[PDB]
Amino acid sequence: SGFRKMAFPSGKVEGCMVQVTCGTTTLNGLWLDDVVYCPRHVICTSEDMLNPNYEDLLIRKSNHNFLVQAGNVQLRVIGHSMQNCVLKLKVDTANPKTPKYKFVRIQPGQTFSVLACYNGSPSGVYQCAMRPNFTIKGSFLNGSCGSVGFNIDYDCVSFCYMHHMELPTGVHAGTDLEGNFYGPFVDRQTAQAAGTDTTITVNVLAWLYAAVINGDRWFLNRFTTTLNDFNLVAMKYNYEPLTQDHVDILGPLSAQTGIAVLDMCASLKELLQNGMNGRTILGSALLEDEFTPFDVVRQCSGVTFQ
Amino acid sequence: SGFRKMAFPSGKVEGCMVQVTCGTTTLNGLWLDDVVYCPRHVICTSEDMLNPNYEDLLIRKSNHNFLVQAGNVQLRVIGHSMQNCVLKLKVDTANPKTPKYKFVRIQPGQTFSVLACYNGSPSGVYQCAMRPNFTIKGSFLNGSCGSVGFNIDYDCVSFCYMHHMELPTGVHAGTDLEGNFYGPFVDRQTAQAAGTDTTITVNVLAWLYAAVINGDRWFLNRFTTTLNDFNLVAMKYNYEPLTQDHVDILGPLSAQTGIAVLDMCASLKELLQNGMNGRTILGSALLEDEFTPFDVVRQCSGVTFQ
Numbered sequence: 001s002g003f004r005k006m007a008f009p010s011g012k013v014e015g016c017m018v019q020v021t022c023g024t025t026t027l028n029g030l031w032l033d034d035v036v037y038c039p040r041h042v043i044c045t046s047e048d049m050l051n052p053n054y055e056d057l058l059i060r061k062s063n064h065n066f067l068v069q070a071g072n073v074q075l076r077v078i079g080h081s082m083q084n085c086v087l088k089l090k091v092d093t094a095n096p097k098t099p100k101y102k103f104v105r106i107q108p109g110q111t112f113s114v115l116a117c118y119n120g121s122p123s124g125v126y127q128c129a130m131r132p133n134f135t136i137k138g139s140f141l142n143g144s145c146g147s148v149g150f151n152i153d154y155d156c157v158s159f160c161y162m163h164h165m166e167l168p169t170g171v172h173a174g175t176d177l178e179g180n181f182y183g184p185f186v187d188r189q190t191a192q193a194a195g196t197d198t199t200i201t202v203n204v205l206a207w208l209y210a211a212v213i214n215g216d217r218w219f220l221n222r223f224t225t226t227l228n229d230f231n232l233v234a235m236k237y238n239y240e241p242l243t244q245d246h247v248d249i250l251g252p253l254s255a256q257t258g259i260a261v262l263d264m265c266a267s268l269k270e271l272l273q274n275g276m277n278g279r280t281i282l283g284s285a286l287l288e289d290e291f292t293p294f295d296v297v298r299q300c301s302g303v304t305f306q
Numbered sequence: 307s308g309f310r311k312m313a314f315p316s317g318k319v320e321g322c323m324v325q326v327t328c329g330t331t332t333l334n335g336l337w338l339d340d341v342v343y344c345p346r347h348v349i350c351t352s353e354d355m356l357n358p359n360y361e362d363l364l365i366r367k368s369n370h371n372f373l374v375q376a377g378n379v380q381l382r383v384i385g386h387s388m389q390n391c392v393l394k395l396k397v398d399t400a401n402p403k404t405p406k407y408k409f410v411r412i413q414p415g416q417t418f419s420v421l422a423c424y425n426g427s428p429s430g431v432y433q434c435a436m437r438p439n440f441t442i443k444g445s446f447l448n449g450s451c452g453s454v455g456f457n458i459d460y461d462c463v464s465f466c467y468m469h470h471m472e473l474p475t476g477v478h479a480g481t482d483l484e485g486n487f488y489g490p491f492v493d494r495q496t497a498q499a500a501g502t503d504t505t506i507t508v509n510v511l512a513w514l515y516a517a518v519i520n521g522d523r524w525f526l527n528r529f530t531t532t533l534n535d536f537n538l539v540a541m542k543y544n545y546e547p548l549t550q551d552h553v554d555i556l557g558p559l560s561a562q563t564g565i566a567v568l569d570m571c572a573s574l575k576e577l578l579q580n581g582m583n584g585r586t587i588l589g590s591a592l593l594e595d596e597f598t599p600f601d602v603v604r605q606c607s608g609v610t611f612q
C-alpha cells in the first residue's frame with residue numbers, strides 16, 4: 001500500500017548526459033550513439049537573446065567551437081547540424097552506455113520523468129505531466145536547459161522532452177527530441193504567455209481509483225451519471241471533457257475495483273460541486289491530475305524496468 | 307523557478323540491486339563489493355511469519371540455498387551471516403558497479419530517496435522523510451522488501467534505509483543497513499502500531515522559505531515571536547518543538563531571503579491559528595513537512611552529484 005508521485009529510475013538517462021559549451025554558454029546535452037543533442041541556444045550570447053538568428057549564428061561556428069564533455073572527458077565534435085530548435089553534434093565516439101531508445105512526441109495529459117541537470121551532471125529526478133496548455137510544472141534554474149524528460153517501457157527509454165525555457169508564473173516549456181516545441185512557444189526572450197490551463201479529468205479519475213485501491217473510499221456516492229451530464233459539470237469547473245477513449249483507458253482500473261467509470265464520474269461531480277469539506281484523499285486536500293491510468297496501474301501492480 | 311518533490315538520481319543504486327531467493331521467497335538485495343545485503347525474512351516461509359526464529363531458520367540453510375541473481379546472472383554465494391535483521395551474503399564476485407558509499411543511520415525529520423524494486427529490478431524512485439514516529443510514508447507492495455533508501459553527497463551514496471514491512475494505515479518500517487530497525491518495530495507478523503506522528507516544524511519553515519524564493523509571499527505577516535511562544539502554539543497543533551539547532555540550520559535560507567527565522571515563525575503561527583482560507587502555497591493546500599532546509603537549498607541552487 002501507499003501512493004506516491006513516482007519517477008522512473010534515472011540510470012539509463014544519467015548515462016547519456018553531457019555538458020556542451022559554446023563560447024561562454026554551458027548547458028546540457030544528450031549523447032546517444034555518436035550524436036549529442038542539445039538546445040540550439042547554446043550558441044547564443046546574453047546579447048543574442050531577444051531576437052536571435054540561429055541559422056546565422058550557427059554558420060559562424062565550426063565543429064571545434066563546441067566543447068563537449070562527458071564527465072571528465074572531452075568528446076571531439078566532427079559534425080554539426082540544426083533540426084528545428086535543437087542541435088545535433090556528431091562526435092567521434094559512440095556512447096557505450098547508450099540504452100535502447102526512441103524519440104516520441106507525447107500528448108497533453110501524459111506524464112514523464114525529468115532528470116534535472118546542471119553542467120552535464122544530474123541534480124534530481126521528478127515526475128511531471130504535459131499540461132493541456134503545453135507547459136510543464138517543473139523545477140528548473142539557469143543552466144538546466146538540455147535536461148530531458150522520458151518514459152521507460154521495459155528496457156526502452158522513450159525520450160519525449162528537452163527543456164528550453166521558463167514562462168511567467170514559473171511554468172516550463174520545451175521541445176521534443178526533434179526540436180519541435182510543445183505549444184505555441186519560440187526560443188527567444190520575448191513576451192510569451194501560456195494559454196489558460198485545464199485539469200486533466202481522466203487523470204483525476206485514475207487517481208480516485210488509486211484512492212479506492214488504497215482504502216480511501218469516503219467520497220464514493222450512490223449515484224451514476226451520463227457522460228454528457230458529467231461533461232457539463234466538468235466544463236464549469238475548468239476540467240477537460242471526458243472522451244469515450246478516456247473511458248476505455250480507465251477500463252482496467254474500473255474492472256479491478258468493480259466501480260463503473262460513470263459511477264466514479266458521479267462521485268467526482270459531487271466533489272466538484274460540494275468540495276471536500278476539509279477532508280483529504282490519499283493525503284491530498286486538492287484533486288490530483290498528474291497520474292495517468294497507466295501510472296496508477298504501474299505503481300499499484302509493481303511494474304519494473306529492465 | 308518552480309519547486310517539486312525531487313528525488314536523487316538513482317543510477318548508482320540501480321547498479322547495486324539484485325534478487326535473492328531462498329526456497330520460495332524472493333526479495334531484493336543490495337550488492338556492494340562482494341557482499342549482498344537483504345532482509346532476513348527471505349528465509350521465511352508464509353508459515354514462519356507470526357513468530358519466526360530467525361537464528362534457527364538460518365542454521366539450516368547453507369550457502370547454496372540462496373539463489374542470488376544480478377540481472378541475468380547468478381552470483382555464487384560463498385558465505386552468509388546475520389547482523390540484526392539483515393543477512394549478509396558473501397559472493398564470489400565483487401560488484402564492478404559499486405559506488406563510493408557509506409551506511410548511515412538517519413534521524414527523524416531527515417529525508418531520503420527510495421528506489422522501489424521488485425525481483426531485483428527497479429520500479430520507481432521517490433522522496434520520503436523519516437517521520438518522527440519512525441515510519442515512512444512510502445509506496446510498497448509484496449516483494450518490495452530489500453528496496454533501499456539513500457542520499458547522495460557528490461559521488462558518495464549514503465544508504466540509510468532497507469525496507470521490511472508495512473504498518474496499519476499504509477505506512478512503512480525498516481532498518482538501517484546494519485539491520486537495526488528505525489522505531490520500536492520487529493520483523494514479525496504481529497500486532498504492531500506506529501506511535502502518534504508529529505509534523506516536522508523545521509521542514510515546514512524550510513518550505514515556507516522555498517515559497518518566498520519562488521515569489522509565493524502572501525502569508526508573510528508583519529510580526530515576530532519568541533521561540534518559546536512559538537513552541538507553545540506548535541505544541542497545540544501537533545508540531546514538534548523548534549530547537550535552537552533547527553534555528554541555526556535555517557540560517558542559510560534566512561540570510562538568503564532576509565527573513566529572520568523568528569519572523570517566519572510568526573507567519574507560521576498565523577497559518578496554524580487561522581488556516582489558509584482556501585489559498586495555496588507552492589500549489590499545496592496543506593503545509594508540507596518533507597523538505598529539509600538542505601533539500602530546499604539544494605533544489606533552489608542546482609546542486610549536482612558526480
Ligand SMILES: *C(=N)[C@H](C[C@@H]1CCNC1=O)NC(=O)[C@@H]1[C@@H]2[C@H](CN1C(=O)[C@@H](NC(=O)C(F)(F)F)C(C)(C)C)C2(C)C
Pocket residue numbers: 027041049140141142143144145146164165166167168172186187188189190191192307
Ligand atoms: C536554460 N538553461 C534556461 C532555463 C530557464 C532559466 C530560468 N528557469 C529556466 O527554465 N533557459 C532560458 O534562459 C531561456 C532561453 C532565452 C530565455 N529563456 C527563458 O527561459 C526566459 N523566458 C522567456 O523568454 C519566456 F517567458 F518567453 F519563456 C526567462 C525570462 C530567462 C525565464 C531562450 C533562448 C528562450
Ligand SMILES: *C(=N)[C@H](C[C@@H]1CCNC1=O)NC(=O)[C@@H]1[C@@H]2[C@H](CN1C(=O)[C@@H](NC(=O)C(F)(F)F)C(C)(C)C)C2(C)C
Pocket residue numbers: 001333347355446447448449450451452470471472473474478492493494495496497498
Ligand atoms: C516485503 N516484501 C513485504 C512488504 C510489505 C507487503 C505489503 N506492503 C509492504 O511493504 N513485507 C512483509 O510482508 C512483512 C514481513 C512479515 C509481514 N510483513 C508485513 O509487512 C505485515 N505487517 C506487519 O506485520 C506489521 F503491521 F506488524 F508491520 C503485513 C500485514 C503483511 C503488511 C515480516 C517478516 C514482518
